[PDB]
């Protein structure tokens with residue numbers, strides 16, 4: 001089997017991407033944030049405290065004929081930006097781009113944090129990291145991808161994120177029309193549960209590629225590109241108007257700049273982000289100062305290849321028993 005689904009920037013910044021998923025019988029369609037940096041399918045639901053729901057679409061399990069209470073199971077999660085939700089656990093039929101899974105764990109929020117309430121466009125999260133990161137106890141869990149793997153034509157899914165446009169998530173096959181050149185594969189480490197890989201260095205603009213190991217995770221659920229302090233400082237030192245803002249919290253530059261490209265290595269291969277990907281947006285509507293799309297990871301503890309990198313590439317998540325990561329240019 002295979003599936004395919006249009007994914008959609010939630011705003012004009014590419015702050016995040018949402019994807020329609022059908023849950024239950026007759027399907028309820030919810031707009032979920034596909035997140036390869038966590039492994040919980042959690043939704044807004046009829047169980048959510050009401051003063052905490054705010055425009056979102058909700059999952060009603062009682063209205064689905066195929067929902068079953070997962071007795072005794074609860075979950076709690078918190079993300080890197082400090083937001084959080086908890087509640088209890090159903091299994092139910094879940095469908096993504098015509099790819100259907102049964103007795104998939106759907107995690108039902110009883111409470112959500114403020115950031116989630118205030119975010120009207122995202123109805124919940126589909127976690128696509130490894131299943132060890134799943135928060136449901138007493139037994140975790142296991143993601144959509146894992147549940148699907150047995151029926152997939154290939155134990156694989158691809159991320160095709162568009163710049164200021166729609167894109168594609170595919171499961172079970174690889175679309176050869178979707179990129180240019182060949183995929184280079186790199187080794188994954190599942191030690192921390194992440195899509196964790198090691199970049200072989202970087203170049204800024206037209207200058208020299210520098211061979212240095214950059215350990216980092218590929219993370220569709222993170223907006224920006226976070227790199228070590230000395231790599232990021234080396235980029236922004238090419239942009240004449242760029243300074244680090246304490247108040248705004250990272251590198252800003254004049255919106256009028258033309259930014260240099262940034263190349264990261266994958267094995268012997270190179271992936272170039274266009275300078276335009278890295279102009280993130282004005283810090284206020286009508287500002288002359290913009291917020292940069294590459295920031296320091298020093299406060300975070302790990303490097304994140306997030307949306308700014310990934311939407312520059314056709315990215316292949318190969319979940320064979322030894323997982324690897326694929327990059328093509330597009």
Ligand SMILES: CC(C)(C)S(=O)(=O)N[C@@H](Cc1ccccc1)C(=O)N[C@@H](Cc1c[nH]c[nH+]1)C(=O)N[C@@H](CC1CCCCC1)C(O)(O)C(F)(F)C(=O)NCCN1CCOCC1
Pocket residue numbers: 010015016033035036037038039077078079080081082083119125133134135219220221222223224300304
């Ligand atoms: C607007 C912004 C200034 C650019 S922002 O940084 O707030 N963007 C958010 C994403 C977002 C999209 C749309 C609307 C609102 C917010 C963002 O980048 N969130 C990061 C926070 C971060 C990391 N570094 C610096 N900041 C995050 O938590 N991302 C997780 C997925 C997100 C969570 C918020 C909702 C959208 C999905 C994540 O899973 O990808 C993660 F990897 F970052 C993460 O925190 N994974 C948590 C891993 N858990 C830990 C507990 O054990 C199990 C595993």
